[PDB]
Design a protein around this ligand. Structure first.
Ligand code: MG
Ligand code: MG
Ligand code: MG
Ligand code: MG
Ligand code: MG
Ligand code: MG
Ligand code: MG
Ligand code: MG
Ligand code: MG
Ligand code: MG
Ligand code: MG
Ligand code: MG
Ligand code: MG
Lengths: 258, 142, 219, 184
RNA sequence: GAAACUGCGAAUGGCUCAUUAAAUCAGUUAUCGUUUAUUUGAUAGUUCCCUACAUGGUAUAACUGUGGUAAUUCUAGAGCUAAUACAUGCUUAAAAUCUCAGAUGUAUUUAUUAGAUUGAUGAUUCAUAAUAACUUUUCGAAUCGCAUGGCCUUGUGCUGGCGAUGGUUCAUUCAAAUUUCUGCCCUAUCAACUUUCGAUGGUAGGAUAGUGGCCUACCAUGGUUUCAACGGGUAACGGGGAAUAAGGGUUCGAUUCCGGAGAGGGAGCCUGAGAAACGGCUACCA
RNA sequence: UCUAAGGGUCGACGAUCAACUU
């Protein structure tokens, strides 16, 4: 329709932003950036709806233009910067670091972390490709290209990214029995261990995941993110650890507060 | 194909050079590929002399979309057939089905020999004509 | 019938109202750049050769530099042409312009003095205007005031005194392309960043080759 | 302008299609180059994405490769002798991909002499190293006595502005020689 | 800090439903069939056939003064004036192999080679590298801000920050364009339709960002159809949805969201990454 | 000024010969 759209009408925004319906006609359209339009979370949304620090978008940009907010080590003064999964949002005024991770309901949970582990971040290797001059490189889930990767880093593996030098410190290899986050689909926000991978040449790769409670759910390889081995996640998990209690036991946990 | 060089242009695979300096054995170096998805490259494709830049094994086209099966209803075109794809369509109000069909024009490589009947397997390729988006990959002459 | 005559030498111009046909027929059928002299046009001007460049007709349409017609016609005008200023990038408009060859239709001609024959006109040499702006670029000031390269040209830049509030703080123009240690530091920073990056890439490639030649030793 | 859309070009059932969506700029075609010979004249076309194409009109020199010794000398195109798509292109000497042209062959003879030193068409022992196994063919050298080498265009002059190509060799050359001794 | 040049935007939005019945659209696919401003990340020691301690006006605006027209967001004539506008143009050894001292970055075009069993894919003539050449030259900052620091031949020294803007290529994102499969209401008082004038396919070319009868040349005689083609009607934009509803259904959906199309009717095109744009232009009709 | 197609005789082609119609 003659070009790229610059508006995002409310009720067209991604639902996991928990945006109010009758606030205005429009939502913050995620600018082009590292992750995606749908799988992103704008800094305005995370500053005005997930922490209530700012009250308006004006106040969000006021917070942003004095270099308070910081996404993955850099300033990111963009009001609608598309921060996403495994991103580190550190603010030095009110010094605290968050890691954008998915709760078990499928929203971007507010997950405070410490500087000693916010130093780095994780990245799912989107592709391994030889660049110009025969220099190998890896592309990660957040759109990062890292040259001279370990010759044993393949697709669907995860790499620990320094986030200050932007290099690969370690890498977890996709295989049966490693801890995986689910970053899309019905089970978006669950954590489990890889049990089996169905190949489906041509079609879509499927993976069967068994959470701590021995629940076994299958999902597409596109949205599973290796985060370490069982019991040793290379990152800190949010308050729920992706267990996916049913509504009955959720109501039970709720009524356990009398 | 009955004097394969039957066109006004010289028919040849691109960038497949038969060097008249080196005294190789075949002298007719022939490129082929494995189409993938477990479709075996036929020996007619391996050893023939046809060119067929639209062949899925020796041509420049890839099979990367849907894999369909159909019944050949016409072989009257050159290197192109029409496959019939019968199915049943559900009408919910009557909780019943009706027979429907869709003809699909498919490019058939000279590697295969296909007649009326001959249930074939076809794989999606890039549009190689106004109506053709599929290449025969398994003849299965039933 | 008017004559906008301009003296580019030292800067001047003025308008005449030539209301007789006999003394203005010297312009008829001349298009651009002819030796129409003062003695040929009128008694006042004499020995003045007029470069006849442009003018406007009745109804106000300007002349077109190379149309070579005695009437006015419509042309699709573009960015880098006269008689039209594009209101938008890529805009073109069909505007009626008047031809290049002079005739009676012209309400006003535009002439450029290129030769001085006899007694000066009172708005031709006596009253003159200064050049509104001095040069701005460093090499432009050098080329103006004759000083060579190694002459430290930041001193006699033409200035201007503003008799406004009895303070008259001179507004000297900024000069561009000036050789300055700020620009030299920028150049050094860039030419050092380049070599630093090249060395970093070279050592990264060396260590990756070391890793390859180590993990190839397993056989 | 010219449109490459399929909203015209009635459907496979033969039905005439109703019109919607007035012609779109992303479906435009353009005029053929019809590249001629001589006095190079290349025009830059602005294409989608800010890119540039080069319409070759009246091209005089092309880069042709022997492909047997891998030289790729730059030479002059004499004329078009065969075109599989239109004899009118041969008649008009319109330079076009897959056109069979004739090239000067003088740079190729000079390279053959500076390389093999073996009197093709009429630092000491490099000619010895490039040993007696230098017989090229019985059809690629008989053309050197006339100084015209049969070649096939491989670039697209209307697209890339260049008229590069390769010298005919082997069964390709035999095919085109049969065609030429028929149609000539 | 007006004005102006430059840059970016004005292709989003908002409106409307006229067209449109395999068309749109819906769900589902593909690009190993392409373009992609911007964002994000990575990436460029190789440039020269008497300036680099910085090249030109070949350049001009705003501005100054002279005007025409009744009138326009009309402009002529004359005098300056800059750039991240325009056009040119060097500094970086060392390392480095081939050719008979020179060439060896990247970009374009062609041909050949490897790309195994020395990376990837289900799969490639893929990524990538190499060779030989080729280019109406592409890029390889002649740009800007705030601080000024360290060493020192104490000078116009040598160095060195944090940035901004720009720039080649790749990847990413926002996109775009094509695209697989299946699904549209009434009508046979529409049963044959398409095919010279492209209809279906083949070869080759042209054109396109790219596939493709998209167009052209030559050739073949095909392609759709009672499982309803083709034609006609729609007071038909499609869908999400709405009304009513035991169950099944019937009817509606111009309209808050998604997709499409249009800006009086057509057509053509400039700019631009992106428009066949209409609060842009050009022409015809009313 | 060309292009294409449409033949005879003789031994998938070769040699030779010939007239117009499109
Ligand atoms: Mg819109
Ligand atoms: Mg390639
Ligand atoms: Mg083609
Ligand atoms: Mg309806
Ligand atoms: Mg309607
Ligand atoms: Mg509707
Ligand atoms: Mg209506
Ligand atoms: Mg809408
Ligand atoms: Mg429109
Ligand atoms: Mg109206
Ligand atoms: Mg329009
Ligand atoms: Mg309006
Ligand atoms: Mg508009």
């Amino acid at each position: 329709a003659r070009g790229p759209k610059k508006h995002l009408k409310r009720l067209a925004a991604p639902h996991h932003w928990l945006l109010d319906k009758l606030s205005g006609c429009y939502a913050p359209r995620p600018s082009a950036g590292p992750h995606k339009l749908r799988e992103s979370l704008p800094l305005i949304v995370f500053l005005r709806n997930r922490l209530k620090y700012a009250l308006n978008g004006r106040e969000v940009k006021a917070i942003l233009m004095q270099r308070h907010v910081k996404v993955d080590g850099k300033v990111r003064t963009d009001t609608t910067y598309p921060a996403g999964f495994m991103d580190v949002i550190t603010l030095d005024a009110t010094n605290e670091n968050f890691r954008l991770v998915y709760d078990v309901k499928g929203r971007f949970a507010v997950h405070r972390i410490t500087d000693e582990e916010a130093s780095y971040k994780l990245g799912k290797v989107k592709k391994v490709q030889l660049g110009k001059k025969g220099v190998p490189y890896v592309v990660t889930h957040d759109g990062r290209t890292i040259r001279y990767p370990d010759p044993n880093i393949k697709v669907n593996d995860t790499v620990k990214i320094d986030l200050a030098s932007g290099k690969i410190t370690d890498f977890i290899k996709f295989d049966a029995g490693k801890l995986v986050y689910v970053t899309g689909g019905r089970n978006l926000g669950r954590i489990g261990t890889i049990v089996h991978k169905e190949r489906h040449d041509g079609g879509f790769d499927l993976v069967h995941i068994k959470d701590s409670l021995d629940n076994t759910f299958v999902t597409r390889l596109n949205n599973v993110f290796v985060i370490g081995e069982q019991g040793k996640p290379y990152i800190s998990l949010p308050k729920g650890k992706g267990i996916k209690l049913s509504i009955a036991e959720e109501r039970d946990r709720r009524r356990a507060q009398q | 194909e009955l004097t394969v060089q039957s066109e006004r242009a010289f028919q040849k695979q691109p960038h497949i050079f038969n060097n008249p300096k080196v005294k190789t054995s075949k002298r007719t170096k022939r490129w082929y590929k494995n189409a993938g998805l477990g479709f075996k490259t036929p020996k007619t494709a391996i050893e023939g002399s046809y060119i067929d830049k639209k062949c899925p094994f020796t041509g420049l086209v890839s099979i990367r979309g849907k894999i369909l099966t159909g019944t050949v209803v016409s072989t009257k075109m050159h290197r192109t057939i029409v496959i019939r794809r019968a199915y049943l369509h559900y009408i919910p109000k009557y909780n019943r089905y009706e027979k429907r069909h869709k003809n699909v024009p498919v490019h058939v490589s000279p590697a295969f020999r296909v007649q009326v009947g001959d249930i074939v397997t076809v794989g999606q390729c890039r549009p190689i004509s106004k109506t053709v988006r599929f290449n025969v990959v398994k003849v299965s002459a039933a | 019938m008017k004559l906008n005559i301009s003296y580019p030498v030292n800067g001047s111009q003025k308008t005449f109202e030539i209301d007789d046909e006999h003394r203005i027929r010297v312009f008829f059928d001349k298009r651009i750049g002819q030796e129409v002299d003062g003695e040929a046009v009128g008694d006042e001007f004499k020995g003045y050769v007029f470069k006849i460049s442009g003018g406007n007709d009745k109804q106000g349409f300007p002349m077109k530099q190379g149309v070579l017609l005695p009437t006015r016609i419509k042309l699709l005008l573009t960015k880098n042409v006269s008689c039209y200023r594009p209101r938008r990038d890529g805009e073109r408009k069909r505007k009626s312009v008047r031809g290049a060859i002079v005739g009676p239709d012209l309400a006003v001609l535009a002439l450029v003095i290129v030769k001085k024959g006899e007694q000066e006109l009172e708005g031709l040499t006596d009253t003159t205007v200064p050049k509104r702006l001095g040069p701005k670029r460093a090499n432009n000031i050098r080329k103006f005031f004759g000083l060579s390269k190694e002459d430290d040209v930041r001193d006699f830049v033409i200035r201007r005194e503003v008799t406004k509030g009895e303070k008259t703080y001179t507004k000297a123009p900024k000069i561009q392309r000036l050789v300055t240690p700020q620009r030299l530091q920028r150049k050094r920073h860039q030419r050092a960043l380049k070599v630093r990056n090249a060395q970093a890439q070279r050592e990264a490639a060396a260590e990756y080759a070391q890793l390859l030649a180590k993990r190839l030793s397993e056989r | 302008g010219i449109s490459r859309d399929s909203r015209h070009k009635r459907s496979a059932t033969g039905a005439k299609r109703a019109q919607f969506r007035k012609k779109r700029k992303f479906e435009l075609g353009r005029q053929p180059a019809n590249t001629k010979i001589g006095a190079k004249r290349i025009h830059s076309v602005r294409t989608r994405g800010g890119n540039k194409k080069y319409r070759a009109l009246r091209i005089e020199t092309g880069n042709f490769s022997w492909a047997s010794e891998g030289i790729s000398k730059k030479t002059r195109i004499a004329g078009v002798v065969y075109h599989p798509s239109n004899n009118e292109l041969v008649r008009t000497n319109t330079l076009t991909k897959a056109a069979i042209v004739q090239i000067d062959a003088t740079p190729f003879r000079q390279w053959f002499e500076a390389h093999y030193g073996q009197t093709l068409g009429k630092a000491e022992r490099k000619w010895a190293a490039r040993a007696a196994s230098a017989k090229i063919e019985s059809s690629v050298e008989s053309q050197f006595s006339a100084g015209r080498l049969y070649a096939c265009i491989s670039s697209r002059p209307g697209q890339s502005g260049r008229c590069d190509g390769y010298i005919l060799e082997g069964e390709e050359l035999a095919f085109y020689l049969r065609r030429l001794t028929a149609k000539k």
